[PDB]
Amino acid sequence: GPVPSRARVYTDVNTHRPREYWDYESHVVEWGNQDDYQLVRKLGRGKYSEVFEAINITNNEKVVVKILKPVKKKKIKREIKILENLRGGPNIITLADIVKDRTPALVFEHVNNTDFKQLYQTLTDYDIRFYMYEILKALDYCHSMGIMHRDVKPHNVMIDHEHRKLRLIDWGLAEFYHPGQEYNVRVASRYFKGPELLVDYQMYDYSLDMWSLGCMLASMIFRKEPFFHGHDNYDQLVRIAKVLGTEDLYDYIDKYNIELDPRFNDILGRHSRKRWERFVHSENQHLVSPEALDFLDKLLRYDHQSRLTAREAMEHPYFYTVVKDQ
Numbered sequence: 001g002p003v004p005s006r007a008r009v010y011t012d013v014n015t016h017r018p019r020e021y022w023d024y025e026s027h028v029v030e031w032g033n034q035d036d037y038q039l040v041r042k043l044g045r046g047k048y049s050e051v052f053e054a055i056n057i058t059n060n061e062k063v064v065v066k067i068l069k070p071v072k073k074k075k076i077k078r079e080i081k082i083l084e085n086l087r088g089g090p091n092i093i094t095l096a097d098i099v100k101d102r103t104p105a106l107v108f109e110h111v112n113n114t115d116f117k118q119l120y121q122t123l124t125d126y127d128i129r130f131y132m133y134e135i136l137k138a139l140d141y142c143h144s145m146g147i148m149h150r151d152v153k154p155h156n157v158m159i160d161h162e163h164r165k166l167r168l169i170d171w172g173l174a175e176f177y178h179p180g181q182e183y184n185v186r187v188a189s190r191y192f193k194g195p196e197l198l199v200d201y202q203m204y205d206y207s208l209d210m211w212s213l214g215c216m217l218a219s220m221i222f223r224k225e226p227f228f229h230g231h232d233n234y235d236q237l238v239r240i241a242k243v244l245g246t247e248d249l250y251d252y253i254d255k256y257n258i259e260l261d262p263r264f265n266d267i268l269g270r271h272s273r274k275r276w277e278r279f280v281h282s283e284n285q286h287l288v289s290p291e292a293l294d295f296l297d298k299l300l301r302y303d304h305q306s307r308l309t310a311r312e313a314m315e316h317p318y319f320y321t322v323v324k325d326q
């Protein structure tokens, strides 16, 4: 069978807290009055929810209402408990209320958001460093509170550029870390899936988010959204293998004694690890620096234990200018 793994950091945080902190199944939910909010317009549609701009007729505060489509009550309780636990934390979206009418809905703070299609073509080298630092604050915080996001991607990072403000949203896939627990690998968007997910290693941890952040950084500095552009879950790993090389991939398999799908045996093949200069061009030259490449390299690793933590990431030279300015 596979070899066990544990997080390098924040390993036993949830064990040291009261049961009710993480035992979300036993969370009783108190439904506020749905008549307090009037829906203005639809902001977005997804698989599991719809999102609307709304007004709160009590205090005329602008608000966002996320009407949940049918999901197991367990996962609603989970998203709510995580949001309440993380409420007040740096760059974490604030859950304001919970209502229904008998479909459940989550009420959130309103945030102005620049279209990340229109925005990621206009970011300076500094802006990327800045917002990356802001994301790391959120990731380090939730990791320290014993929580994996498991869906870090451009969509779930809302940026108010005018106010240099950033919020990490959509904690519907987030889970509590527990040492020894085997998790569902069918999580995250395909382009941001860590190798642990793609090879079906279930005993993963916070470090999963750091891989996803690496995919985000890669796309930003190299101007390729997405960076690893797989046609399916199998091909996704091939795209990675064509960059990170296959030597390290198989060492990862051997180390953790992972039972690799026989399908992969055919299509992975033998690929060398590529230098990052390959993805540098005239257009993306101004965003790429020796620091950025060092930082990115230490994020994007097969072995999840060998990736940077969020706090380690924050101490990297990449962010020296940003740290000084605050």
Ligand SMILES: O=C(O)c1ccc2c(c1)nc(NCc1ccccc1)c1ncncc12
Pocket: 043, 044, 051, 064, 066, 093, 108, 109, 110, 111, 112, 113, 155, 158, 169, 170, 171
């Ligand atoms: O699920 C959540 O945790 C959550 C929390 C807050 C918001 C949200 C989702 N979605 C918003 N808008 C839809 C959207 C967001 C980004 C790109 C495209 C569409 C939104 N808008 C303004 N203020 C807040 C939010």
